[PDB]
Symmetry: none
Subunit: 323 residues, 2 copies
Amino acid sequence: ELKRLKKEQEKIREEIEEVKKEIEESKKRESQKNFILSLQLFISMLRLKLLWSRALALQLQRERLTDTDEVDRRREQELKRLKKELEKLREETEEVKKEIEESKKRPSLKNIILINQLLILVIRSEYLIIRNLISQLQAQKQEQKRSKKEQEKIREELEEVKKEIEESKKRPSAKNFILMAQSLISLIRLLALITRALNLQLQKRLKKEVEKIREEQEEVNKEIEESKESLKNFILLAQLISSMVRLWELIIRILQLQLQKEDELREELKRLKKETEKIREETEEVKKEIEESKEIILMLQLEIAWIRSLLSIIRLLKLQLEQ
Amino acid sequence: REEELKRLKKEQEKIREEIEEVKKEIEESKSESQKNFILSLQLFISMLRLKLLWSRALALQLQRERTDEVDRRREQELKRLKKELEKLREETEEVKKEIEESKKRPESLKNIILINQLLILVIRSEYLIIRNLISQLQAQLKQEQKRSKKEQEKIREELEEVKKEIEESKSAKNFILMAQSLISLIRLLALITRALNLQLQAQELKRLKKEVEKIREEQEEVNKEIEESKKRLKNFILLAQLISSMVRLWELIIRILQLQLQEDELREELKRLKKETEKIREETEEVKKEIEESKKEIILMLQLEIAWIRSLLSIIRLLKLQLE
C-alpha cells in the first residue's frame, strides 16, 4: 500500500521546486520582499511535511515486519537520506531567517514580519520533532540534551514575539493576522508539548495543557468561521493552520495509547479513527474552498500541495491505527 | 571551421574501431554469467556507437548554422546516420531477447540482468532523441513526433515494470546506486523528447523545469552516496560515475533546449551552461584518470569505459561550440 503514497512525495515535490524556482527569478526583480519571504517558509514547511511523511512510513514498516533487521537495513540508509533533507531546510531556513532580521531595521506591513517569525518559530520546532524521531530509529543519550536547551530557545523567542502582538491586538481587517498569529502561537505552544512527548518516548500533565490549547484554538476557529476579497484568501491560510493544530493534537493523542500498550485502548482507537477522518474531511472541504479562488498566484499553489501533503500523512496515519 | 570539426570528426573514427574490435572480440568470446556479462559489453558497445552518432549528428547541426555544399552535405550524412541508427536498434532487440531467455533461468546475476534491462530502455529512449534531431535536420513529419511520443510511453511502462522488480528485491548497495542512476537518466531522456516535441509545436515547458529539478536533487542523493562508497569492485564504482555524468550531461542538454526555446536574462542562463559545460569536461577526465590508473571482461570493460570518456568529451566540445 505505502508505495502508493511514495509517489505523491515526488508529485508534491514538483510544484515545490518550480514555485521555489519562480521565487528567485522575481527575487531578482519592502512588501514584495516579505511576500516572497513568506512563501519560502511555506516551502520549507512543505518539505518538512514530506520528511515527516517519510518518517511515518518508516515506523509503519518498522512494525509490519521486525523479525530480523532487513527492514532495519532499508531503514538506516533512508534514515541518513531524510536526516540530510532536514539540514537542507536548516540552511534554507537560515537564508529567510536573516532576511527577516535586516527587514526589521527598516522604516499592515509591520505585522507581516511577526507572522514570519512565528512561521520560523514553527519550523524550528517541527524540526526537533523530526530530529528526535529520526534518531529514535538508530537505537533499534546523544540526542536528548539538544532539544532541552533548544526548547528554551524557541520559548524565549515565542515569549518576546507574543508580547509584541497583544501590544497591537489591543490597538485599532488585518485583525485576521491576529487569528493566524494566534493560531500559530497555539501551534507552537501545542508543538512544544509534543517534544515533551517525543523525549518521553526516550527518557500526563500535557493532556491538560493540551485541553488548554484545544478550547483556545476552538475560539479562533469559531471566529474563523464567523469571518468567512483580498484578505479572504488569507482566512483560508488561517484555516490551513487550524487543521495543522487539530492534526497535531491528534498526533499526541496517539502518543499516549501506545504507552498504555488491553481493550479500552480500542475505544480511544475508534475515537482517533473518527477524528482522523474529521480533519481529513475538513481538510478536503478546504481543498474545494482553495480551488475556487480563480503573488497571490503562487500562494494558492503551495496550499494545494500543503493539502495533498497533509492528506498523504492522514492517509498514512489511519494505517498507524491498524497497528 | 572544418579544421575544428575535422579533428573532432576524426576522433569519432579513432573510437569506432576500438568499439568494433571489442565487438569482433565479443562474439569471438561468445556459463550463463559469462554470456550475460558479454551482453552488457554489447549494450555498452551500442551505447558508445550511439554517442558517436549523437556527436556526428551534432557537428552537422553546427556547420548548418556555419555555401551550397552545407546543404548537399546534408542528405549525405543524414542517410549515413539513419542507416547506423537502425542497425543499432536491430542488435538491441536480439540482446533484449537473449536476456528475456536468461531471466527464465534462475543467480546473483539477476542484479546484472536487471541493469541490462535498464540499459536497453536507456538505449531505447536515446534512439527517439537522435531521430528527433536528424529528422529535424532533414525537415530543413507530424507522425515522426508521434512515434517518438508513442515509443516513449512504451519505454515508460517498461521502466516502471523493471522498476518494480528492483524494489521487489531490495556491494548490492552499489547495484542500486547504479540502477537508480539509470532510472533517473531514463526519466531524463523522456523529458528531452517531450521537450523536443514541444519545439515543433511552437508554455508547457514549466512542467519540464519541475521534473528536471526533481531529477537534479535525487541524482545528487545517489551522487553523494557514491562518494562515500569509495572511502570504505572499484570498477563497478567508476562505471557508476560514468552514469552520473551522463545525467549531468543530459541535464545540460535539456538546459540547452529550454534556452534554445525563447537579452541579459538570455546571457544570464546562457553563460551558466558554458560554465556548466566547463565543469562536466573536467569531471569526465577525472573518471578518465582512475580508469587509466587502475591497471577477462575487465580490460574489455576498461577500454570501453575509456572510449566512452573520450567520446563524451567530444560531445562536450561541440556543445560548448554550439553555445555560441
